[PDB]
Design a protein around this nucleic acid. Structure first.
Ligand SMILES: Nc1nc2c(ncn2[C@@H]2O[C@H](COP(=O)(O)OP(=O)(O)CP(=O)(O)O)[C@@H](O)[C@H]2O)c(=O)[nH]1
Ligand SMILES: *C(=O)[C@@H](N)[C@@H](C)CC
Ligand SMILES: [Mg+2]
Ligand SMILES: [Mg+2]
Ligand SMILES: [Mg+2]
Ligand SMILES: [Mg+2]
Ligand SMILES: [Mg+2]
Ligand SMILES: [Mg+2]
Ligand SMILES: [Mg+2]
Ligand SMILES: [Mg+2]
Ligand SMILES: [Mg+2]
Ligand SMILES: [Mg+2]
Ligand SMILES: [Mg+2]
Ligand SMILES: [Mg+2]
Ligand SMILES: [Mg+2]
Ligand SMILES: [Mg+2]
Ligand SMILES: [Mg+2]
Ligand SMILES: [Mg+2]
Ligand SMILES: [Mg+2]
Ligand SMILES: [Mg+2]
Ligand SMILES: [Mg+2]
Ligand SMILES: [Mg+2]
Ligand SMILES: [Mg+2]
Ligand SMILES: [Mg+2]
Ligand SMILES: [Mg+2]
Ligand SMILES: [Mg+2]
Ligand SMILES: [Mg+2]
Ligand SMILES: [Mg+2]
Ligand SMILES: [Mg+2]
Ligand SMILES: [Mg+2]
Ligand SMILES: [Mg+2]
Ligand SMILES: [Mg+2]
Ligand SMILES: [Mg+2]
Ligand SMILES: [Mg+2]
Ligand SMILES: [Mg+2]
Ligand SMILES: [Mg+2]
Ligand SMILES: [Mg+2]
Ligand SMILES: [Mg+2]
Ligand SMILES: [Mg+2]
Ligand SMILES: [Mg+2]
Ligand SMILES: [Mg+2]
Ligand SMILES: [Mg+2]
Ligand SMILES: [Mg+2]
Ligand SMILES: [Mg+2]
Ligand SMILES: [Mg+2]
Ligand SMILES: [Mg+2]
Ligand SMILES: [Mg+2]
Ligand SMILES: [Mg+2]
Ligand SMILES: [Mg+2]
Ligand SMILES: [Mg+2]
Ligand SMILES: [Mg+2]
Ligand SMILES: [Mg+2]
Ligand SMILES: [Mg+2]
Ligand SMILES: [Mg+2]
Ligand SMILES: [Mg+2]
Ligand SMILES: [Mg+2]
Ligand SMILES: [Mg+2]
Ligand SMILES: [Mg+2]
Ligand SMILES: [Mg+2]
Ligand SMILES: [Mg+2]
Ligand SMILES: [Mg+2]
Ligand SMILES: [Mg+2]
Ligand SMILES: [Mg+2]
Ligand SMILES: [Mg+2]
Ligand SMILES: [Mg+2]
Ligand SMILES: [Mg+2]
Ligand SMILES: [Mg+2]
Ligand SMILES: [Mg+2]
Ligand SMILES: [Mg+2]
Ligand SMILES: [Mg+2]
Ligand SMILES: [Mg+2]
Ligand SMILES: [Mg+2]
Ligand SMILES: [Mg+2]
Ligand SMILES: [Mg+2]
Ligand SMILES: [Mg+2]
Lengths: 205, 86, 392
RNA sequence: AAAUUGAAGAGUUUGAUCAUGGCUCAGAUUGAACGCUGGCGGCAGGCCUAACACAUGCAAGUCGAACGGUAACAGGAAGAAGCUUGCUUCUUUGCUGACGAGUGGCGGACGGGUGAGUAAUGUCUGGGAAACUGCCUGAUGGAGGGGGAUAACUACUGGAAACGGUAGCUAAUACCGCAUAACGUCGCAAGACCAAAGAGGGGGACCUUCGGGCCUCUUGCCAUCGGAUGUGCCCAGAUGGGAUUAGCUAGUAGGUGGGGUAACGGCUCACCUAGGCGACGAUCCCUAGCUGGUCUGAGAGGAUGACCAGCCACACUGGAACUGAGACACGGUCCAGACUCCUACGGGAGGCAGCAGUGGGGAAUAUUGCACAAUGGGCGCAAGCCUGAUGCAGCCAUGCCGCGUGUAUGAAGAAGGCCUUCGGGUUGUAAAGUACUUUCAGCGGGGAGGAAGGGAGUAAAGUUAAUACCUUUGCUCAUUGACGUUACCCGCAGAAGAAGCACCGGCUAACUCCGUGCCAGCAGCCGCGGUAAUACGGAGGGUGCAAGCGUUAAUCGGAAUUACUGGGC
RNA sequence: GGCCCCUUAGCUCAGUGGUUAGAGCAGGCGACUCAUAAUCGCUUGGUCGCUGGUUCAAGUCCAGCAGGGGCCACCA
């Protein structure tokens, strides 16, 4: 129930970096970003409205690494809440455990954080949680178990993390390896490269 | 009957039927005696037949063979008709 | 409901063969009668064996029949076989599970064509021992032609590598023994003694994966499909899980009951002749010639090459060679399948009585492994035998 | 505070146009089935068809504290061999615990299954009066004295069996009169009439044939009036289709009198009157269990009643009553029928739409499993016994949900496939190579919760003549788990054991080469194929979903295409 | 498990042992057409279900098997 194929193809097809590698190297030296994958790569399409809506939805899904059934459940939840559907959907994707573990610089990629969480190396409030989609609430403390403080992966990720823009809703202590929420991010705290109204128009057909 | 509790119930029910039939027969006998005495036209014979009848229906109701309302019905009808004639 | 079967003596499988109307079923009934009279409880009558309506009408044997008896040293399961030339497949299926046969020859007739055919097939299938019983001695009272019959039987047996000068022969009459004549009943006990002494105790391999060749299928009311046969190797326990591997596609099942002569068991070992009750199997889903095996042990195949000998004259055989495109029948265990032949490059004409390396392809898969013996037959004529060499 | 945030179109009639009007597509859902493929777990669900026919084992018993008793078992006693002088053997004893059969009480009308029949004798909503009600509960009363039987048992005897018969004997909370009777019944009154049963524990003093009397405590017994629960009856409105079904009705509509019922009533009879229903759809024909609810929809509506809960009806087919507080009675009785059996030929036996299981029908649907540890039920003062209800386990990708099948780096942009303007492009950081991790599966070691109670002793307070018995409240002491190798935790080795299906002309996301040549073939709708096919078949590349993916069947939406909201001649 | 029937070209059917196994309807090639139908000129075809026997001679006679149809049993 995971995607286990080549990763640069997805960013090539979306025509935009998806932060899907570590970041030690500029992605110009790794793939030819300007081309779509395959034999008919340089050829260009003329997308319709269905095409652009589908591409936007796929791009968000590949960013966060969620499959279609559970994404549909997320949309239904966000539509059930009281507010704006796009804001709720983006905040709801931003609250799952592996995204938070990546977001405070413990894994180099989202798959790093996925394997860290799945292999019983993370605690929330002094309790082991082994599930990626775990929604984390405000005023929660996320930490690495004492048994897992000696791997080189964690400090390599920590050294890759501080050369990146700091999230304004997490508080991190690298020496103790602790992190704490304050509250959920707002729309202005996330990238403006995403139009969620296309998502809503695709799922509210 | 293929369970060793229905056979006992069948035997007991047959005995109880045989027991109840005779009491019902005697009670009906006395009732129709009073009815015949009324039909004849005499008034004293009807009265003494009714006086002989009344304890029988009272006791038979008390033993569960009939209901109190049945005995009261019989007594009421017979009293009404007996006092009707001259 | 049902009683239980207890194991107290070594168990042996025997049976009867011979020409038609020489007295096989009468002997089969007489043995049980006399033994039960002395000790036991068998008492299995003549019409209790030939029970099917056509058998009762035409007065012959069409199927094979199973009876049981026991001397106070052994426990015998006995198989009675037909004697007609066009029931031979049933006789082969019955004789594939014999530890030793009894050859019935009538003194009035002598050896006959079916006697020789049965002897030859017992050679080619692998029956280890043969006892000779000479029947209808009440008819013939001369003591000179009996020598002629005995001699002729002796060289007939010897010609097919069976030990002729050493095999025992018994005179008697099954009709008189069954009637109750105390004089002739001694010959039955002499036959029983030779049956106890000449046949040794065979070896049973009970440390190998379980395997059972299916030979007959029944539907028991209230219970389901039952398959019978003789356990080749291993052990089967109630509750264990089995594989039906054979000429159809493979199936999975579970064992839910084992019995031996209608007596309840709890597990069947090698050498017994048992019926096994399967769970959730329909009666047209299964058939004679399949294999009931331990899962993931044996496999089916269709194409293979082998080493084989061809019979010659004065042995049945053929009086003419064969070439490519030849399609005879191959007998494996309790099965016969048509197959297409491929001779090695060169050596086209095949002499009647040589060896050869041939490749063969079957029309249905067979549960097969190297070092498996088979026979070759067509049109009422046995022609050879071989050993599975390599499987492709 | 919140209990609401609600409505989208596209293809196809023409040389092109506008309108009208049908067909088809994009969504959600299922007791699904088939094809290809398939790692683990949690929670659910699983004969829709033949209410067809059924082998075998289980699904309803319990009380000795109502009774006479002793077939079995264990204790006690008295005679009794032997020696370790009574160690050990034997026999007679219901004396004790207990208890097969028998009389008696209660339960078997509950619990479990199925949807054949039934368009209203049923169901839903709202009301009413002419009634009964075991076990539970409140109040006021009583609870005296007699009798005749019988089962078991003994003797004889019939029958293949199931099962009987004749003669003796005995007990009771079994059965039947008498006495007493009121707020009970009948009657205007005066009056007349009706019932009952004993057992169990302990004991100071007093008489004991010395069995008991006597005191005390507990539980049962009868009558009457209440409470609560259940059940019977009446009325109004609503609850499919057909007018190519328009007339129907003789106990039929009403009245009087006799009977009947727990109770009102043509409920039933005799007589009198001539009425009663119907276009607001009677009568007849077809189909069908009803509801809370379920799917869809912006709503109004449309389709539907599988699992869970309330009501109804049925129990091989057709009738009938008996017993009881309650039945016209799933594992009861009687009679008739068709099937399947046993028989000594005279006669007998049976009913899976209970839980498993078999054959048959079908496109299609599961184990002849474990336990009464928990909840609930029957009997018992209790201990306890019974429970295919129930609690669990097995099978099945049938559905919903969660997780895994590694992770970072890696240009030689390697080999090999494919395309090529012969320069190169693409698969592609993909692989190999390097450095890390160990969830799940495998092996070893620890380890919650589902358990409340019941038993023994002791202490105090109640009761009383009584520190005895009994009840209530505390404490102490040993125990009660089918699931089960539980959930979960700790350690070990190693990337090691784990990815498929549909599609790529437009609708609709995704393009080229070869083979064939209106042939072979494809298709939901328009439509492709006649020698240069993005549409057929294979290959390379790509798109969408993912332990699933496609196809078929069925419903609503789009459909304002039955139009009340909301259409026309 | 036993017994009894059928199998000739693409389709529907003849052919009773004497040696190229035939008829009709269909089909193939050349001229015309972008391609056909029609018109003109030439025409090719079978595993006689398969394997093995008897006969100088087998589609034909004798057996076994494969595929399909129809009757009858046996019940650890
Ligand atoms: N005089 C005599 N007659 C005998 C003897 N044995 C058999 N028979 C006769 O032969 C007849 C047939 O014998 P049977 O035993 O049936 O022979 P079979 O071998 O079973 C024939 P199939 O091969 O079909 O089974 C019987 O009816 C019997 O009367 C014997 O020893 N003596
Ligand atoms: C029954 O199953 C057994 N006695 C025999 C018949 C098996 C061959
Ligand atoms: Mg999933
Ligand atoms: Mg009196
Ligand atoms: Mg003969
Ligand atoms: Mg003979
Ligand atoms: Mg025979
Ligand atoms: Mg004969
Ligand atoms: Mg002869
Ligand atoms: Mg059109
Ligand atoms: Mg056009
Ligand atoms: Mg159309
Ligand atoms: Mg649809
Ligand atoms: Mg399937
Ligand atoms: Mg069925
Ligand atoms: Mg049904
Ligand atoms: Mg008893
Ligand atoms: Mg049930
Ligand atoms: Mg019920
Ligand atoms: Mg119904
Ligand atoms: Mg139902
Ligand atoms: Mg009504
Ligand atoms: Mg008495
Ligand atoms: Mg007497
Ligand atoms: Mg007496
Ligand atoms: Mg009263
Ligand atoms: Mg009164
Ligand atoms: Mg009064
Ligand atoms: Mg008075
Ligand atoms: Mg008085
Ligand atoms: Mg009195
Ligand atoms: Mg009294
Ligand atoms: Mg009382
Ligand atoms: Mg009372
Ligand atoms: Mg009372
Ligand atoms: Mg009441
Ligand atoms: Mg009430
Ligand atoms: Mg009248
Ligand atoms: Mg009246
Ligand atoms: Mg009246
Ligand atoms: Mg119906
Ligand atoms: Mg309801
Ligand atoms: Mg609408
Ligand atoms: Mg809704
Ligand atoms: Mg419903
Ligand atoms: Mg349904
Ligand atoms: Mg059902
Ligand atoms: Mg019934
Ligand atoms: Mg029936
Ligand atoms: Mg039935
Ligand atoms: Mg009936
Ligand atoms: Mg009654
Ligand atoms: Mg009631
Ligand atoms: Mg009943
Ligand atoms: Mg019931
Ligand atoms: Mg039943
Ligand atoms: Mg069943
Ligand atoms: Mg039934
Ligand atoms: Mg079928
Ligand atoms: Mg089938
Ligand atoms: Mg069970
Ligand atoms: Mg029982
Ligand atoms: Mg059950
Ligand atoms: Mg599952
Ligand atoms: Mg277990
Ligand atoms: Mg497109
Ligand atoms: Mg296609
Ligand atoms: Mg081409
Ligand atoms: Mg072209
Ligand atoms: Mg549809
Ligand atoms: Mg509409
Ligand atoms: Mg529609
Ligand atoms: Mg209108
Ligand atoms: Mg219109
Ligand atoms: Mg031209």
């Amino acid at each position: 129930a995971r995607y286990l194929g080549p990763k640069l193809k997805l960013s090539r097809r979306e025509g935009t970096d998806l932060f899907l590698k570590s970041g030690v190297r500029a992605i110009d030296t790794k793939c030819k970003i300007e081309q779509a994958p395959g034999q008919h790569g340089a050829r260009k399409p003329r997308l319709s409205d269905y095409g652009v809506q589908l591409r936007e939805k796929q791009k968000v899904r590949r960013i966060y690494g969620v499959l279609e059934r559970q994404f549909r459940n997320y949309y239904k939840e966000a539509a059930r809440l009281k507010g704006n559907t796009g804001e709720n959907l983006l905040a709801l994707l931003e609250g799952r455990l592996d995204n938070v573990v990546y977001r405070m610089g413990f894994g180099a990629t989202r798959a790093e954080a996925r394997q860290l969480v799945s292999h019983k190396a993370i605690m929330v409030n002094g309790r082991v949680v082994n599930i990626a989609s775990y929604q984390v609430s405000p005023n929660d403390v996320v930490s690495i178990r004492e048994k897992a403080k000696k791997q080189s992966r964690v400090k390599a990720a920590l050294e890759l993390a501080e050369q990146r823009e700091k999230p304004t809703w997490l508080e991190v202590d690298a020496g103790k390896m602790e992190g704490t929420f304050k509250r959920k991010p707002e729309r202005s705290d996330l990238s403006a490269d995403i139009n969620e109204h296309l998502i809503v128009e695709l799922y509210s057909k | 009957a293929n369970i060793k509790s229905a056979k006992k119930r069948a035997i007991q029910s047959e005995k109880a039927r045989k027991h109840n039939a005779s009491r019902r027969s005697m009670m009906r006998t006395f009732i129709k005696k009073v009815y015949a005495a009324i039909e004849a036209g005499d008034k004293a014979a009807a009265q003494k037949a009714f006086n002989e009848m009344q304890p029988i229906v009272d006791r038979q109701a008390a033993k569960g063979l009939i209901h109190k309302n049945k005995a009261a019905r019989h007594k009421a009808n017979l009293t009404a008709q007996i006092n009707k004639l001259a | 409901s049902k009683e239980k079967f207890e194991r107290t003596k070594p168990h042996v499988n025997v049976g009867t063969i011979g020409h038609v109307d020489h007295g096989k079923t009468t002997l089969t009934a007489a043995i049980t009668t006399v033994l039960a009279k002395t000790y036991g409880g068998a008492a299995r009558a003549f019409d209790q064996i030939d029970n099917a309506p056509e058998e009762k009408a035409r007065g012959i044997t069409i199927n094979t029949s199973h009876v049981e008896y026991d001397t106070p040293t052994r426990h015998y399961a006995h198989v009675d076989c037909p004697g007609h030339a066009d029931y031979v497949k049933n006789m082969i299926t019955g004789a594939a599970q014999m530890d030793g046969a009894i050859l019935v020859v009538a003194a009035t007739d002598g050896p006959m064509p079916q006697t020789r055919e049965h002897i030859l097939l017992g050679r080619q299938v692998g029956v280890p021992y043969i006892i000779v019983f000479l029947n209808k001695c009440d008819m013939v009272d001369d003591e000179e032609l009996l020598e002629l019959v005995e001699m002729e039987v002796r060289e007939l047996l010897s010609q097919y590598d069976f030990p002729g000068d050493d095999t025992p022969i018994v005179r008697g009459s099954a009709l008189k023994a069954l009637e109750g004549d105390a004089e002739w009943e001694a010959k039955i006990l002499e036959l029983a003694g030779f049956l106890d002494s000449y046949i040794p105790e065979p070896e049973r391999a009970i440390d190998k994966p379980f395997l059972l060749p299916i030979e007959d299928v029944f539907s028991i009311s209230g219970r389901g499909t039952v398959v019978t046969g003789r356990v080749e190797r291993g052990i089967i326990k109630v509750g264990e899980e089995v594989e039906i591997v054979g000429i159809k596609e493979t199936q999975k099942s579970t064992c839910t009951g084992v019995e031996m002569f209608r007596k309840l068991l709890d597990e069947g070992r090698a050498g017994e002749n048992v019926g096994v009750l399967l769970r959730g199997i329909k009666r047209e889903e299964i058939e004679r010639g399949q294999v009931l095996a331990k899962p993931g042990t044996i496999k089916p195949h269709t194409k293979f090459e082998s080493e084989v000998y061809i019979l010659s004259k004065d042995e049945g055989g053929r009086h003419t060679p064969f070439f490519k495109g030849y399609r005879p029948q191959f007998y494996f265990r309790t099965t016969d399948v048509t197959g297409t032949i491929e001779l090695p490059e060169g050596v086209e004409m095949v002499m009647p009585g040589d060896n050869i390396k041939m490749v063969v392809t079957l029309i249905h898969p067979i549960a097969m492994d190297d070092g498996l013996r088979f026979a070759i037959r067509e049109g009422g004529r046995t022609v050879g035998a071989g050993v599975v060499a390599k499987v492709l």
